[PDB]
Amino acid sequence: VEVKKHKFPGVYVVIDDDGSEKIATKNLVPGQRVYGERVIKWEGEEYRIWNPHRSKLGAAIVNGLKNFPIKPGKSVLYLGIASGTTASHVSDIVGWEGKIYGIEFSPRVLRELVPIVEERRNIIPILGDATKPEEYRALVTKVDVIFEDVAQPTQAKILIDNAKAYLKRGGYGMIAVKSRSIDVTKEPEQVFKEVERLLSEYFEVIERLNLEPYEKDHALFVVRKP
Numbered sequence: 768v769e770v771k772k773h774k775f776p777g778v779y780v781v782i783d784d785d786g787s788e789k790i791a792t793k794n795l796v797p798g799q800r801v802y803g804e805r806v807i808k809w810e811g812e813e814y815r816i817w818n819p820h821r822s823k824l825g826a827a828i829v830n831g832l833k834n835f836p837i838k839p840g841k842s843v844l845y846l847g848i849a850s851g852t853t854a855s856h857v858s859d860i861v862g863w864e865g866k867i868y869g870i871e872f873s874p875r876v877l878r879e880l881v882p883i884v885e886e887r888r889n890i891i892p893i894l895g896d897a898t899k900p901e902e903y904r905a906l907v908t909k910v911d912v913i914f915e916d917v918a919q920p921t922q923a924k925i926l927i928d929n930a931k932a933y934l935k936r937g938g939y940g941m942i943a944v945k946s947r948s949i950d951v952t953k954e955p956e957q958v959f960k961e962v963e964r965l966l967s968e969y970f971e972v973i974e975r976l977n978l979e980p981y982e983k984d985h986a987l988f989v990v991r992k993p
Contacts, residue, residue: 770809775835777860778828779814781807790817790828792859796886802852815859819981822853823916823943826981834974834989836912836939840864844907844933846897846925847916848890849876857914858887868907870895897925900932907933913940918948923965926990930969934992940970946984955984966990 769782773790781789794813800806805816819826828835837843839862848854848869858867869884869892871877877894884890895903897917910933915926926942934940944962946955953961959975966972970990978985 768807768809770807770814773828775828775838777839777862778817778835781814781816790819790825791815792817792856795859795862795889799886801883802855804852815856817856818852822851822856823978823982823985823987824853824914824941825856826978827943827976827987829981830976830978832974832976832987832989834939836941836989837861837914841911842908843867844910844913844929845869845915846913846929847871848892849880850916853914853916854884854890855887858884858890861889863889865889867891868893868903868910870897870903872896897929900929904932909933909935911935911938913938913942915940915942918945920949922949923962926966927969930992936992938992939973940988940990940992942966942988942990943978944986944988945982946986955986959986962986962988 771780773780779791781791791814794815797813807814817825819829837860841861845867849871867890869890893903893906913929913934917925926940946958949958963972972990974989975986
């Protein structure tokens with residue numbers, strides 16, 4: 768097994784004995800395996816395999832995502848942090864000089880998460896309603912990136928409203944859109960066209976990529992705040 772650097776900083780390529788390729792991040796918390804994930808020991812460091820079946824962002828990267836604004840030392844406002852393994856990998860990537868404000872609506876989801884992210888002290892889990900971003904104003908600063916995974920009909924407006932409140936000028940947004948969570952009747956491609964239009968009222972839309980076959984009728988959008 769070999770580990771080399773991916774094009775994106777803080778992301779790694781693992782090449783298995785048979786020459787097949789996987790993506791990975793460097794474990795922020797050596798010794799830890801909270802998802803019972805596959806960890807590769809290499810030159811004295813640990814690398815956590817980033818499974819595209821457990822992480823929509825992992826899927827996007829495997830699928831050839833070109834713009835990835837999450838990088839070491841960045842601050843991230845993360846809407847929907849409890850879903851999948853993504854927060855763990857984002858935490859590895861941003862490292863100890865970066866920061867992640869994790870917003871969850873449910874007190875149950877938050878209580879279940881804290882054990883899992885306890886050691887990742889660059890994650891600050893916050894109870895909040897992402898539709899009303901001003902309610903967590905006292906707990907969140909201006910950020911470099913918003914990452915959003917919120918399966919709600921107004922998820923584009925959620926992104927704009929949080930960006931108005933917290934995103935630095937020049938900063939980026941990333942949003943994993945489940946087509947059916949906005950509109951079960953419309954074709955996925957039509958839903959995505961509508962999301963792209965709504966986002967474009969506020970953002971420059973930089974990229975959009977489908978997540979098949981890891982997800983069905985999901986697209987991830989990268990946007991930039993003017």
